[PDB]
Each structure stands twice: as C-alpha cells, then as structure tokens.
Amino acid sequence: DPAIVQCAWAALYCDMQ
Amino acid sequence: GEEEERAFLVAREELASALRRDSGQAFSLEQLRPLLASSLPLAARYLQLDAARLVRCNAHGEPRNYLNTLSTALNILEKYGRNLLSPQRPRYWRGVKFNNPVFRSTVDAVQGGRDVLRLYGYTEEQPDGLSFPEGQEEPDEHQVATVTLEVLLLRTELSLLLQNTHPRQQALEQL
Ligand SMILES: *CC(=O)Nc1ccc(NC(=O)C*)cc1
Ligand SMILES: [N]
C-alpha cells in the first residue's frame, strides 16, 4: 500500500495507543 | 448457480481463515482471482458491504479522483479490520475517535465509511466516535474477517477498474 496511506494509518493507530 | 455460489463461498472462507490465522497476511491478485473473476452479481459478491452505495453515492467528478478518495478510505477501513484480528493490538482498540483530522480526511471523506466500522463491531455511538459495547470483551473474529476481506476486495476491484483490467470489467462498469 502507498506510504502516504501508511502515514494516515499511523496517526489513527496512535489514537488507539 | 450452485457450483458457482459454492466456489465463491469456499474461496471466501479460505481467505477469511488466512486473515484469522495471520492478520498481516497479504493477498496477491492471483489469490483473489476466485472472487474477482466470479460471475456472481454485485448483490451476491458483497454480503456485508453496501458496495453499491459506497461507489455510486461517492461518484462525484472524474473516476480518477473519487475512486482514489474511496480507495484510501477502504485501505484505512481494511487496516482497522486487520487491527481487530491482530492478537497484539494497541491498548485502546475498543474505540475509534472521529476528531482526528486524518480520520476526517480519509474515512469520513466518503459516505458510508463510518458505517463500515459498525460491521466490525464498533456499534455503540459516541459524541466523538464509535466503540464496542462495554460488555463485549473480544471481537467476533469470523465477522471481522469477512468484512475485512470484502473491504479488501472492493478496493481491489476498484483498482482493477482504474487500470482498465478487471476480469469482468463489462458488468461492473455500471458502478
Ligand atoms: C508519513 C508519516 O510518517 N506519518 C506519520 C503520521 C502519524 C504518526 N504518528 C502519530 O500521529 C502518533 C507518525 C507518522
Ligand atoms: N496508548
């Protein structure tokens, strides 16, 4: 998957930590 | 008919099982070909995702653009599903918070994106998002697997329509 989407997901994954 | 319906459902469980066994498992196009090349109509291909509305109700502008916006949202929703299937999750997986500007610009940028999270189990409405029922302590693995596969498949089918390479592009060009 494009790295730009992985940037998005990492921000959302942060919200769950 | 029956053989085609059976092959489709069996192929779905093979992939859903792989996701339940390994949430990080990636699938190639060839491993998804049983579902992409299946002659089943759209209502039969997607049992959980309202894929008709997801595409048609976000079809604003050039297909190059709103298929990309929808692809990003589906990509993120897939990772939410894989996250619930991961045996190692972040501590507060039980709630999704909408206020995140990255959520607002990806999932909340398409109609129906929020509703997909409900199919994972994020069913209780919050002012700031959606969460699991406090009684439910673990997610329905089989349900999450099926939705995750459908979200993965829908993004895949959209990408193959984008490159003019869907095996059944003719019938699915209606979307
Ligand atoms: C491109 C990239 O590295 N993006 C990115 C976004 C978010 C986060 N982390 C948090 O928001 C906590 C890291 C990296
Ligand atoms: N966290």
Author numbering:
A (entry chain C): 1 to 17
B (entry chain A): 3 to 177
What does the paper say about this structure?
We began with the E3 ubiquitin ligase RNF31, which is an integral component of the linear ubiquitin chain assembly complex. RNF31 is a 1,072-amino acid protein comprised of multiple folded and disordered regions. We screened two of the nonenzymatic folded domains, the PUB and UBA domains, each at multiple concentrations and in the presence or absence of a known binding partner. Most hits for the RNF31 PUB domain could be grouped into two families of related clusters (C41 to C43 and C44 to C45), both of which competed with the natural binding partner Otulin, and both of which appeared to contain a critical tyrosine residue – also found in Otulin – but that had otherwise dissimilar logos. Upon solving X-ray cocrystal structures of member from a representative cluster of each family, we found that two Helicons, FP06649 from Cluster C44 and FP06652 from C41, bound the same site at the protein surface, but that they engaged this site using completely different binding modes, with the critical tyrosine residues oriented differently. This observation was our first structural evidence of the ability of Helicons to identify distinct binding solutions to a common site, which we have since observed for several other target proteins.
To target disease-causing proteins that are inaccessible to small-molecule or antibody therapies, we are exploring the use of a nature-inspired drug modality that exploits the intrinsically favorable properties of synthetically constrained α-helical polypeptides (Helicons). Here, we report a rapid, high-throughput screening platform utilizing phage display that enables an unbiased mapping of the α-helical interactome of a given protein without any prior knowledge of its structure or known binding partners. Analysis of 14 high-resolution crystal structures of Helicon–protein complexes across six different protein domains reveals a range of binding modes, all of which are “side-on”, i.e., mediated exclusively by Helicon side-chains rather than involving main chain amide interactions. Biochemical and structural experiments demonstrate diverse functional impacts by the Helicons which bind these sites, including inhibition of protein–protein interactions, inhibition of enzymatic activity, induced conformational rearrangement, and induced dimerization.
